[PDB]
UniProtKB/Swiss-Prot annotation:
One of its GO terms (biological process) is actin cortical patch assembly. It comes from Saccharomyces cerevisiae (strain ATCC 204508 / S288c). Present with 1970 molecules/cell in log phase SD medium. The chain holds residues 15 to 146 of 613 of the full protein. The keyword Repeat applies. This is Epsin-2. Keywords: Cytoplasm, Endocytosis, Isopeptide bond, Lipid-binding, Membrane, Phosphoprotein, Repeat, Ubl conjugation. Its main location: cytoplasm. The keyword Repeat applies. It is found in: Cytoplasm; Membrane.
Length: 132
């Protein structure tokens, strides 16, 4: 019931201790230039970027994917972020503390602040994308 690309996004953002591999990130960036795949990718990231609490790994890993797409993927990836900028901005406020009382949300807030800064700086974004 999944397309190839959907399987790839699901694995890249799974609730586990792995970080998205460069191979998978590059696959997603390349596939984002195909409009059918682009929409499949973003729909899955939308779901997982909007997760919370003990499922924070879905959020963290989706933010990793999203940053990579903004830098290396199609222009459509940038367009999506600007449409959905409010949601990305809210991730700067993401909260979750684990059983040990450790703040698992901090990594998400840091990632989100860095992505918001990049998206707010058109020239820097365009320069990075051009060099990539
Ligand atoms: Cl397929």
């Amino acid at each position: 019931g999944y397309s190839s690309t959907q399987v790839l996004v699901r694995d890249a953002t799974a609730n586990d201790s792995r970080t998205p591999s460069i191979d998978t990130l590059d696959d997603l960036a390349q596939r984002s230039y195909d409009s059918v795949d682009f929409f499949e990718i973003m729909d899955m990231l939308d779901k997982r970027l909007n997760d919370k609490g003990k499922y924070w790994r879905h959020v963290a890993k989706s933010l990793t994917v999203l940053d990579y797409l903004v830098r290396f993927g199609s222009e459509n990836c940038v367009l999506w972020c600007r449409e959905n900028f409010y949601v990305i901005k809210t991730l700067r406020e993401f909260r979750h503390e684990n059983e040990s009382g450790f703040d698992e949300g901090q990594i998400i807030r840091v990632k989100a602040k860095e992505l918001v800064s990049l998206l707010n700086d058109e020239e820097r974004l365009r320069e990075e994308r051009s060099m990539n």
